[model samples]
Target chain A: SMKIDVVTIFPEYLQPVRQSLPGKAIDAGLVDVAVHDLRRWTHDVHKSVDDSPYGGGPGMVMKPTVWGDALDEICTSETLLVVPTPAGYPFTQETAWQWSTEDHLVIACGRYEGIDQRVADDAATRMRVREVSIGDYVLNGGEAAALVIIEAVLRLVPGVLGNASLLEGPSYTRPPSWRGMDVPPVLLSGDHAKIAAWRAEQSRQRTIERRPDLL
Target chain B: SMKIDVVTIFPEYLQPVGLVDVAVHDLRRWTHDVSVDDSPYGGGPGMVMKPTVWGDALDEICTSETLLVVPTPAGYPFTQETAWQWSTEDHLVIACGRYEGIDQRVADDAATRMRVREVSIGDYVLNGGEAAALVIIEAVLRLVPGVSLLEGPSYTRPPSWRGMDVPPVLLSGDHAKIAAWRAEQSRQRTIERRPDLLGFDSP
Candidate 1:
């Protein structure tokens, strides 16, 4: 089973992990997750995790010292440090596929501006540190990114998902006809080969029309 | 305050929406005895969202002015600019799809009445769209308020930690110099990590 540790200032933002599919996976013992408060590593009375950004900016930056200490204790030789930020490489389906094979994943969720760059710069020494962005948009913090990452990654860790078939493209269910529209005629033809080909063609067409970048 | 209504099977996954003037509704509310998904019509991997459930939910929540956003890996990318445009909209009915995305007809039907925007948070696949809905919520909220390459390195406090030192320019007290240093760092970082952002190599 893979071990997931998420360190964030707002542990509450990560409640989804317990209510979503991952929670079911955890119950099934497919994976184990522990959410840690960044303040737990702080020494000050405020349990402060952020401060004025160097060179001055609009928002605070997560202090390196706090993150340094936290990562030092959380990461090990087998650990893969996943830092979620807006600037990192986009987290892709392949990224999830690849991470599902790892033994441990420690996701450091950043708030304010973001975690100190050195935290990742330094920790990449002992373990594989992968900086990931959820998308092209900027996040208020990394907790949502963390949840999204967990959902994507955990689903790939065998047994977590009952059906391992590729999922995407349009879908349908019973009634087939609703609001005067019917499921594509080919689907009801009862031809598996034709269904597969229509699905592929529709997928390609959809991607080309709305997601040319994907094509 | 903006009105945001999210519909999903895992309503608990959208707990973060409590912070905004948002409402979380279970898609199953429109289901039969708690059933919401069925097999894909054109056979493929995984089940497809029952259009019946989504249609009922959308008709209940959507108005003529609502922006119907459906997050999917197969949709167009959601960007900062997209957030800005959405921030001005009077209403958003984010239909969070699970399993395979909501049946194609759901969006097609919704489009006849509302502005349907099927968006993707990234190139990744997830167990459901609830997480992406959270990301979309966070991104859009900033505009209701507001990063400089937007991804330059960030540092705070003690300047030095375990021998790693904050750049000297940051401490120079010269706002001009500090700004230049940050600009270059952001440019270089973006070039090395996300040249797509700068459009440096696209032909």
Candidate 2:
């Protein structure tokens, strides 16, 4: 089973994840997930995981040192490090599928402004450093965004979906419209050939509308 | 008490928002809450609000239709209509906020997404749009909705918040159904009423 460890200040956010879908998946032996408090790795008496950036900035950035130690303690042979931030690449269905297959996954949830860049530039040398965005928006805390990624990825795991293809038609259909709705029509046609083409067009449309730069 | 209307696909989102101390106490007073389905109005399948939830949430919860409307900054103005609606309802559900925003599918259905107008608290983008949602919620709930927690509209007392007062027109009580009588005046009130509401509907 795959394992994911999350680091965050508010442990309560972790509680919901544990009780909700992520927790359910883990308990069923589909995956293993752990939530860690960043304070555990801090040496400071106040246990601050954040500080002003080396360069002047408006908001606090998480300290690279704290992130480094936390990641080190959690890293395993197959761990993939994920950082959810607007600055990171948009999180997508494809990325979630890949992470779900890994043996271990480490996610860092940041507050204040963001995490120190060094966490990626230094500590992430052997790990996969991915920045994922839910959409073209700004969330004050990373917990909400990270949770979205976690849920999306977990859905891609085998057995997690009672019927994986049950989702394929809705998300991947193209033609820009269907049955008065814009999703592709072929989704309901039950024609496999038509379905394949619609998915291609839909993927293209979604990427173009939101992240044309990616293409 | 101001009425706020919230439409969301994930009902669980209210749990977190409910936990915040600043809003929790104030929110309970007359906040006629409801969760609505959001089927896609745009015909896209992934984003639609479930039909059952959207229908009941809007139909059952709405009372005044004025004071506090849905806290979405889409196409609707956060004007006297919202405030007026809230004044009558005295409380409401602020769309609890949506992650992807309302599905266009739901947006097109007049019975569901069409009931309320969209309002942006500010130009800045918030992650889930809840921050923006709450900002509008707090503002509208406090102002025209007539603080149910307080008493009936009291023109004699100055507003607890500094530099903010009920509109001279409202105090005058010409009432002539202000928002409906003069669109420009209603629009003007929103502009001067909350400077943040300006520049949004401008273009």
Q: Which candidate is the best by DockQ?
A: 1
Candidate 1 iRMSD in angstroms: 1.9
Residue A215 C-alpha lDDT in model 2: 52
lDDT for residue B109 in candidate 1, whole number 0-100 = 95
Q: List the RMSD of every prediction in angstroms.
A: 2.7, 16.6
Residue-level lDDT tens digits of model 1 in B128-181: 788888989888987874212556888877878778898899988899998888
- After superposition, which runs of candidate 2 have C-alpha atoms over 4 Å from their true positions? A22-24, A161-215, B1-10, B18-53, B62-107, B111-203
lDDT of 2 by residue, A1-215 (tens): 77778899876675545545444555688876678888999978999777663323256667766777888788754567887764455455667667778877788888877775556654456766776555334555677666666666765677653323111112321224423565445555667776677766765664554334345
Question: What DockQ, between 0 and 1, does each candidate earn?
Answer: 0.71, 0.03
Q: Pick the candidate with the highest lDDT.
A: 1
State how far residue A11 of model 1 sits from its true place (Å).
0.6
Q: Which residue segments of model 1 deviate by more than 4 Å? A: A21-29, A161-168, B18-20, B32-34, B145-150, B200-203
lDDT of 1 by residue, A98-195 (tens): 99988899999998888888899889877899998878787788898999888888778887654362334577778868899988888889898888
Q: List the residue pairs that clash in candidate 1.
A: none
Candidate 1, residue A148: the lDDT equals 88
